[PDB]
Coordinates of C-alpha atoms in Angstrom, one line a residue:
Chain D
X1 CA -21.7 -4.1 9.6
X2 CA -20.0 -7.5 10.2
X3 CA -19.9 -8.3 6.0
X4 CA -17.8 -5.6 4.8
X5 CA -14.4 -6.9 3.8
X6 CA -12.5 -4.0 5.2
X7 CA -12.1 -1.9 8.5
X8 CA -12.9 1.8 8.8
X9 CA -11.5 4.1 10.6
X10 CA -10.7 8.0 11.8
X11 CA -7.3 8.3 13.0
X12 CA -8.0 11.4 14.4
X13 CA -10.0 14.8 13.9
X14 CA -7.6 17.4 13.0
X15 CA -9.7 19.9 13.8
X16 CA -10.1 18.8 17.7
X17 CA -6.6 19.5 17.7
X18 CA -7.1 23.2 17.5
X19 CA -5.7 23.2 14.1
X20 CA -7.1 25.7 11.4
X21 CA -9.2 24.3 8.4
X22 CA -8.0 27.7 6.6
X23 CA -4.3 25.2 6.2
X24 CA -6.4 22.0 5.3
X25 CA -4.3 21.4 1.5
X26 CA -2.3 19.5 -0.5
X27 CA 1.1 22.2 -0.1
X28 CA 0.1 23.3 3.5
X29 CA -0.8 20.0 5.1
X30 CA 1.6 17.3 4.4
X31 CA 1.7 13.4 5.0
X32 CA 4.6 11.1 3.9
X33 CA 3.5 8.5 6.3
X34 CA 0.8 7.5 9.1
X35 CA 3.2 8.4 12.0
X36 CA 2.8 12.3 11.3
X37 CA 0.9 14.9 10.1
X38 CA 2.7 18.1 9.7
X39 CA 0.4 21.7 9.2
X40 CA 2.3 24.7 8.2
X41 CA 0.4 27.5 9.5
X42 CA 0.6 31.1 7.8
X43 CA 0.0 34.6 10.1
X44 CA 1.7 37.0 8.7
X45 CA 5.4 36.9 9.1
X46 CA 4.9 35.1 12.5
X47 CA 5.1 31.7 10.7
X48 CA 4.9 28.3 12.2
X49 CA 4.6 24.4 11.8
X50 CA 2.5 22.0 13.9
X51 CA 3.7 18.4 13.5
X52 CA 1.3 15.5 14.6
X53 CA 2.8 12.6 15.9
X54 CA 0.1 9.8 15.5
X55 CA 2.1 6.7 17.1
X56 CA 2.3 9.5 20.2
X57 CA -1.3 10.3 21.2
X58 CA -1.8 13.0 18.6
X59 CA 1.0 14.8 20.3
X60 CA 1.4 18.3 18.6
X61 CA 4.6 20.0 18.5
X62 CA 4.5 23.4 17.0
X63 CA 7.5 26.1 15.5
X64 CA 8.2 29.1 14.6
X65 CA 9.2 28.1 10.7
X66 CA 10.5 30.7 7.7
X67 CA 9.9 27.8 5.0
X68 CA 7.4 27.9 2.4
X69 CA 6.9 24.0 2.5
X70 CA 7.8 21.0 5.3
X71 CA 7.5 17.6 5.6
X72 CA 8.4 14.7 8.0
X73 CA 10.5 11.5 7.7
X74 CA 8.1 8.4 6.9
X75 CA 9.4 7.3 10.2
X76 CA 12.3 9.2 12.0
X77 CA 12.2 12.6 13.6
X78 CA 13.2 14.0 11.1
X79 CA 11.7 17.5 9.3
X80 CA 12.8 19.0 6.1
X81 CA 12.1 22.3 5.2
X82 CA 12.4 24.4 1.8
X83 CA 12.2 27.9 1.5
X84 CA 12.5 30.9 -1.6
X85 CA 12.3 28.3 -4.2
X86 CA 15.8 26.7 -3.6
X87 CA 17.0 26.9 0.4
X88 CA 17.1 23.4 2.1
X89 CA 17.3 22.7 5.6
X90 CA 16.9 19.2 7.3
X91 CA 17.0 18.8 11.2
X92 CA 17.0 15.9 13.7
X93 CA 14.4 17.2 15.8
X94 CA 15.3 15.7 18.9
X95 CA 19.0 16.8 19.1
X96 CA 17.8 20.3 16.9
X97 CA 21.6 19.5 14.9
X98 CA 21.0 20.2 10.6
X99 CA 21.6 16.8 8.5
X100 CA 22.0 18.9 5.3
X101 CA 21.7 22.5 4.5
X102 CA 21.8 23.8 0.5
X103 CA 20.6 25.6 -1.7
X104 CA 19.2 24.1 -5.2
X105 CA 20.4 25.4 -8.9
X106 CA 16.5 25.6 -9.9
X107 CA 13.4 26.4 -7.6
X108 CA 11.6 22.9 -6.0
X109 CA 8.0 22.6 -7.1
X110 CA 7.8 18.7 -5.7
X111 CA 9.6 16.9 -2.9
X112 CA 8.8 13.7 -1.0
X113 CA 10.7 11.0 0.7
X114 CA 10.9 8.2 -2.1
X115 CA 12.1 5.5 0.7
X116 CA 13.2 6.0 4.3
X117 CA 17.0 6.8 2.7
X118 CA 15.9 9.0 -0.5
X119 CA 14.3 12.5 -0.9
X120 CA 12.9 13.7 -4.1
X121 CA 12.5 16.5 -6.0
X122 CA 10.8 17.8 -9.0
X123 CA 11.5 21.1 -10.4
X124 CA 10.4 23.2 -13.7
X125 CA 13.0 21.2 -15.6
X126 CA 14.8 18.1 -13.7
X127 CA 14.2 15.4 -11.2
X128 CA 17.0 15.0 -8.4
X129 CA 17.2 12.3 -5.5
X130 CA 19.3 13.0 -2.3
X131 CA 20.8 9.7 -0.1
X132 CA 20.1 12.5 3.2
X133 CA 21.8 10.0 5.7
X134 CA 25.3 10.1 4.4
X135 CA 27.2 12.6 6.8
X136 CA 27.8 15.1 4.0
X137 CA 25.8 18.2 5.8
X138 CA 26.4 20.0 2.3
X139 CA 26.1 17.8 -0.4
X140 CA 23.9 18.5 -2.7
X141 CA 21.2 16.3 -4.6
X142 CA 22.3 14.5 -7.8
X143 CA 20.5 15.1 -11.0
X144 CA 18.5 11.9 -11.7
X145 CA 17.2 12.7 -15.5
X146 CA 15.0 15.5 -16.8
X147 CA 11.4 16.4 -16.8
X148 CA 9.5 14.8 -19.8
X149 CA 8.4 17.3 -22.4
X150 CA 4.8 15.9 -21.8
X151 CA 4.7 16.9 -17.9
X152 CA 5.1 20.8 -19.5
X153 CA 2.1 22.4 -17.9
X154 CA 1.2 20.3 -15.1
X155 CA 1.1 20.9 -12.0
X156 CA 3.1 18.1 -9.8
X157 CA 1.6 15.9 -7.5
X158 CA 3.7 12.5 -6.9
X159 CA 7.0 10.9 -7.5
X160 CA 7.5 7.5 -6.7
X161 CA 10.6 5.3 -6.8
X162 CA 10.4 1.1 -6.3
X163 CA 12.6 -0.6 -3.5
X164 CA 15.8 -0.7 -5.6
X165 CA 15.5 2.5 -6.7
X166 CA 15.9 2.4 -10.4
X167 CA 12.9 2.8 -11.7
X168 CA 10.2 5.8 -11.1
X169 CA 7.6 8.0 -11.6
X170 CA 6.8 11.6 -11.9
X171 CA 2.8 12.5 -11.8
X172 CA 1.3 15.4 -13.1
X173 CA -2.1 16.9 -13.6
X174 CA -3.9 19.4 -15.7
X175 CA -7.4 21.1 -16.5
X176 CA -8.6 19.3 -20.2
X177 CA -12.4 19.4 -21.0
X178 CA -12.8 21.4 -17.4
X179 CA -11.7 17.9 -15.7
X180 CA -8.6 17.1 -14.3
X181 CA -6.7 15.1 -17.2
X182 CA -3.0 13.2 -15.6
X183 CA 0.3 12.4 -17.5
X184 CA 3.2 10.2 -15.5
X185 CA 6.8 10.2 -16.8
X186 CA 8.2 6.8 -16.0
X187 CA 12.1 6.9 -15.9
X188 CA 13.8 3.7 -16.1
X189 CA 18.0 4.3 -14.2
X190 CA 19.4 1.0 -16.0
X191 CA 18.2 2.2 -19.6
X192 CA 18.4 5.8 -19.0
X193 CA 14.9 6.4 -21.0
X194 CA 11.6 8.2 -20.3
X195 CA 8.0 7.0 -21.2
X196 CA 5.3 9.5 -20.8
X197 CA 2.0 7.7 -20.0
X198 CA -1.7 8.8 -18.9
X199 CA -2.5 8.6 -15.7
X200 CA -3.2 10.1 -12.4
X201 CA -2.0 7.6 -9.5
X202 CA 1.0 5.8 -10.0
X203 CA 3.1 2.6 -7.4
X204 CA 5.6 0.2 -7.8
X205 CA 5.0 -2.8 -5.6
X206 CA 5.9 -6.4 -5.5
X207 CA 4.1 -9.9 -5.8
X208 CA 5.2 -13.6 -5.0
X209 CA 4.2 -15.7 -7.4
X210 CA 3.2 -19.5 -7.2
X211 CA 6.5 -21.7 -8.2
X212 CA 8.9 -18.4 -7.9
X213 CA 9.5 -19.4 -4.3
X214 CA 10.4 -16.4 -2.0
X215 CA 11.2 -13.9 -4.7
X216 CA 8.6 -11.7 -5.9
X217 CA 8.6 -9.9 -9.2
X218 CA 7.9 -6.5 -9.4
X219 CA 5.1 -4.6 -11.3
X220 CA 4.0 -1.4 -11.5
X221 CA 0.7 -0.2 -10.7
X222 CA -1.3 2.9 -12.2
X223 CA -4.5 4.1 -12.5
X224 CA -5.8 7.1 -15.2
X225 CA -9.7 8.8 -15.8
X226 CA -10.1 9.8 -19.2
X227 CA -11.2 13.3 -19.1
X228 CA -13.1 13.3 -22.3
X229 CA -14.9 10.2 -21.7
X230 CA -14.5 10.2 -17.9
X231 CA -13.5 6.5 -18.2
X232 CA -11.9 5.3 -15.3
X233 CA -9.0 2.3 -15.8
X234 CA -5.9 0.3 -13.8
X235 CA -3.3 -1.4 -15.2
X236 CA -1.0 -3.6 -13.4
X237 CA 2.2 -4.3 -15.6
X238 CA 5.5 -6.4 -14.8
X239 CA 8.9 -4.4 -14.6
X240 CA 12.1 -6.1 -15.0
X241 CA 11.4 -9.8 -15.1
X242 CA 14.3 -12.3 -13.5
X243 CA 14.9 -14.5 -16.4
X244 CA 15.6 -17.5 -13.8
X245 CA 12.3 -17.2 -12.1
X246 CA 9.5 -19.5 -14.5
X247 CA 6.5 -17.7 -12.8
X248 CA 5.7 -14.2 -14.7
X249 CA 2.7 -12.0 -14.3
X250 CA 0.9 -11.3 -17.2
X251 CA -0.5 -7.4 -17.7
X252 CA -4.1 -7.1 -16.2
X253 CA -6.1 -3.7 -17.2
X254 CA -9.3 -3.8 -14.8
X255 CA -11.9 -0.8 -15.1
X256 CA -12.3 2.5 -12.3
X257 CA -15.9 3.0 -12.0
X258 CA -16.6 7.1 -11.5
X259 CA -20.4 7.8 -11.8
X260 CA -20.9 9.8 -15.4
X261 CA -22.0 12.9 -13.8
X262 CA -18.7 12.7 -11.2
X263 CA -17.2 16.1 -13.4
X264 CA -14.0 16.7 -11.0
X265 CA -13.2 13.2 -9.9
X266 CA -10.1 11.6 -10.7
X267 CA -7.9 9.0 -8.8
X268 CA -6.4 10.6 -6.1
X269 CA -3.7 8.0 -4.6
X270 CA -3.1 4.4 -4.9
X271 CA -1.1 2.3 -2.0
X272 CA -0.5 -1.5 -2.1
X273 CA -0.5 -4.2 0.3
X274 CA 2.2 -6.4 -0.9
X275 CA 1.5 -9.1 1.9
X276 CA -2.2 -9.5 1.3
X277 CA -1.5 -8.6 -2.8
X278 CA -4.3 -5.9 -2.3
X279 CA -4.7 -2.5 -4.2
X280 CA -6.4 0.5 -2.8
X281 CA -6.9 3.2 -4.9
X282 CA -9.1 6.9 -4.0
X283 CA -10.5 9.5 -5.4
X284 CA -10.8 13.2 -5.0
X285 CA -14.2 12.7 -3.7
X286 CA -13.7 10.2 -1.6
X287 CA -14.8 6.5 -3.4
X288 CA -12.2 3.8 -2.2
X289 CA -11.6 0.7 -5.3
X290 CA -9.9 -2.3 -3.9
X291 CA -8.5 -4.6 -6.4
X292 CA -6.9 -8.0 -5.7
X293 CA -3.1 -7.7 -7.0
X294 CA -2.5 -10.9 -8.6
X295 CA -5.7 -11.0 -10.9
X296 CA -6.4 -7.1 -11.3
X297 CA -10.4 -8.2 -9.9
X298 CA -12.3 -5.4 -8.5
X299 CA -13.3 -6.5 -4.9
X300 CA -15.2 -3.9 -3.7
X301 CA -16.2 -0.4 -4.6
X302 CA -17.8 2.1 -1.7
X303 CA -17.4 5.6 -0.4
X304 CA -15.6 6.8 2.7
X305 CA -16.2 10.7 2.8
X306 CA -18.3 13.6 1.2
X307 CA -15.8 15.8 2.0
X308 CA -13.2 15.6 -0.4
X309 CA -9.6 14.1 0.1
X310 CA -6.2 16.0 -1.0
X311 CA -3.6 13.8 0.5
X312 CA -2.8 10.0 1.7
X313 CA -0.2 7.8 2.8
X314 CA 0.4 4.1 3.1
X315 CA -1.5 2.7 6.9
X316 CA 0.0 0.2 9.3
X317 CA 2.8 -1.1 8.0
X318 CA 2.3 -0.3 4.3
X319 CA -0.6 -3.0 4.7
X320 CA -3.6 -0.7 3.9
X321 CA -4.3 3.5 2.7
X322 CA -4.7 6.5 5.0
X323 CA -6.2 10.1 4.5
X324 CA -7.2 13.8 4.8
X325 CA -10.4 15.3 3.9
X326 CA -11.1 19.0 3.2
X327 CA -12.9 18.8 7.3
X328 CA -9.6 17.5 8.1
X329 CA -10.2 13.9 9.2
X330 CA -7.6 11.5 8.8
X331 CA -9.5 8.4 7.6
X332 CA -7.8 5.1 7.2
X333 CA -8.9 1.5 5.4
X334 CA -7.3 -1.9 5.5
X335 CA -8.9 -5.3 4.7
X336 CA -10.4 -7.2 7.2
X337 CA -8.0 -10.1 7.5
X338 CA -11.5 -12.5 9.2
X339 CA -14.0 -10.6 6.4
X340 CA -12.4 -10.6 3.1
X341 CA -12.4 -14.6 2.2
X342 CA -15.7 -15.5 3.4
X343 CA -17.0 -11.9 1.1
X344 CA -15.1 -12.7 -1.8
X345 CA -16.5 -16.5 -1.6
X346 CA -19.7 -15.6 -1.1
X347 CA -20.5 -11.8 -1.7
X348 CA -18.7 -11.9 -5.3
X349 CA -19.3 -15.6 -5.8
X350 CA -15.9 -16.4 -6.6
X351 CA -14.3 -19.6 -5.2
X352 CA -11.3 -19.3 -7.3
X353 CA -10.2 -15.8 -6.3
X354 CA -10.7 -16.4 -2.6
X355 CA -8.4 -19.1 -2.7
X356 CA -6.0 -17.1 -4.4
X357 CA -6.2 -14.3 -1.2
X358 CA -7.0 -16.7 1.3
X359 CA -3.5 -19.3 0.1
X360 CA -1.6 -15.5 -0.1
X361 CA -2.2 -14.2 3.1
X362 CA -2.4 -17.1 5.9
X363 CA -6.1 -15.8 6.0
X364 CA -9.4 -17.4 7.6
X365 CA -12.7 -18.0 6.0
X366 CA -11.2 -21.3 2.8
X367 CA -10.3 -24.3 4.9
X368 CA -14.0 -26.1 4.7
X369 CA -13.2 -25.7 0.4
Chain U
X1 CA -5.4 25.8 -1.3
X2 CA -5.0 27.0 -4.8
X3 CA -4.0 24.1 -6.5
X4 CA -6.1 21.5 -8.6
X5 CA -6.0 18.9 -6.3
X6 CA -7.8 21.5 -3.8
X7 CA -10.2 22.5 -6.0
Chain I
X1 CA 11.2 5.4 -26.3
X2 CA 8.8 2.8 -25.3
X3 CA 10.1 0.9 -22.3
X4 CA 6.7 -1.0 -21.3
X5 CA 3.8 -2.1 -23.2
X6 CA 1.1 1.3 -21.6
Chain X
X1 CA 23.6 31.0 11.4
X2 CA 19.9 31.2 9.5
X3 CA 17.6 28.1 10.4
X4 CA 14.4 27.5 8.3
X5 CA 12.7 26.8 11.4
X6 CA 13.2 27.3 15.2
X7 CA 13.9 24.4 17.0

């Protein structure tokens, strides 16, 4: 269908890797990035690990692994592993030599790789980061603030950091009304001070804006369902405006559609484009919203998979969204860099906002305008 | 998967 | 504390 | 000694 303004595609079955749907969940089946996949597999004592290696053919490595959680480096062979709450052990898989080794004041409920240099962790009471390529084998990871009172009873699902590292986010979520309600501490370093916010999905990106030159400004991205009303809504909000710059980006709040009767959904990840300036943002049960960064416009609204999605990761160079469904596909969107001006001239009707993509991204489809 | 996100 | 206007 | 996993 030579109109949509995106590309669809299946990365690969998981299951036509021999790999068990019985380990097809958020804790078991991990993905920090499009270059792996990692599976912890549970039979009995006899415990194991089969890591994915998508840039490699699918190639499958599988362990013999004692941890109760694993995940891989966004982009180096590199696999940490966490065991009895508070034992963690990070190898270079190809020499098989231990970059750190500790063991945690407080049990880890939440860890991900927050850039290619940071991991972070969430536990019942505090939020640590660890700078894991230092050389220090034993050092352990510094205490970055504490948990918000208002993430009490959640259950954690994200932490996000932007580039400089300064300012983040803890997500959690919880059962209100018998639908999934989301609350998001955002931590800012240079103040030392916690917001609690609603919302379910949660990035920082970046945005260059006309007359600002080559410096972008940064805004934060986030997107919350009401679980009373079950409506859906994204903001997009400027962090830490550069006084110098005379460009700024003014706050745009654009509605999520979820269909009424859609009980259980709720946004389910959020990745950004920042070369194109385009959001995608999921849900549980599979609809895909993309939004155009700079204007907060919805562009296009569809559905990708029945089956329902419980992990994703930035695709292909951080320029589009990857994921896993309960059947264990990993399915993966990105705008169509021919498709998108022509539809948003033409299919939304909407001269202005094409030029806008079209001027932002070198893209085809304007120059008869 | 007995978490809310699996449910 | 409110740091940002959500 | 004690590795998490067995590489």
């Amino acid at each position: 269908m030579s109109d949509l303004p995106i590309e669809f595609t299946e990365l690969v079955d998981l299951m036509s890797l021999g790999i068990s749907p019985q380990f097809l969940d958020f804790r078991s089946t991990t993905f920090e990035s499009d270059h792996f996949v990692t599976v912890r597999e549970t039979k009995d004592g006899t415990n194991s690990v089969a890591i994915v290696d998508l840039a490699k053919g699918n190639e499958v490595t599988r362990k013999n692994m004692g941890g109760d959680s694993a995940i891989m480096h966004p982009s180096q062979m590199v696999i940490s592993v966490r065991a009895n709450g508070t034992i963690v052990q990070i190898f270079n898989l190809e020499t098989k030599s231990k970059l750190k080794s500790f063991t945690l004041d407080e049990p880890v409920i939440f860890w991900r790789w927050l850039s290619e240099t940071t991991l972070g962790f969430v536990t019942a009471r505090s939020i640590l980061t660890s700078n894991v390529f230092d050389g220090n084998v034993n050092a352990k990871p510094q205490l970055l603030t504490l948990r918000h009172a208002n993430l009490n009873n959640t259950q954690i699902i994200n932490f996000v950091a932007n580039k400089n590292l300064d300012w983040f986010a803890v997500v959690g979520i919880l059962q209100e009304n018998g639908r999934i309600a989301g609350r998001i501490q955002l931590f800012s370093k240079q103040r030392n001070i916690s917001q609690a916010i609603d919302g379910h999905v949660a990035i920082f990106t970046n945005i260059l804006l006309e007359g600002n030159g080559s410096t972008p400004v940064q805004v934060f991205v986030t997107g919350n369902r009401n679980a009373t009303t079950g409506a859906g809504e994204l903001r997009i909000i400027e962090i830490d405006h550069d006084a110098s710059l005379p460009s700024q980006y003014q706050k745009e709040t654009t509605d999520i559609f979820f269909p009424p009767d859609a009980t259980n959904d709720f946004p389910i990840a959020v990745q950004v484009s920042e070369k194109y300036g385009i959001i995608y943002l999921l849900t549980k049960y599979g609809f895909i919203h993309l939004y155009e960064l700079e204007t907060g416009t919805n562009l296009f609204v569809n559905r990708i998979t029945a089956e329902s999605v419980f992990t994703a990761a930035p695709y292909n160079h951080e320029n589009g969204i990857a994921c896993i469904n309960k059947k264990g596909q990993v399915l993966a969107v990105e705008i169509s860099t021919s498709q998108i001006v022509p539809y948003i001239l033409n299919k939304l009707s909407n001269v202005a906002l094409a030029l806008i993509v079209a001027t932002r991204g070198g893209l085809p489809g304007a120059d008869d305008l | 998967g007995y978490t809310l996100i699996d449910l």
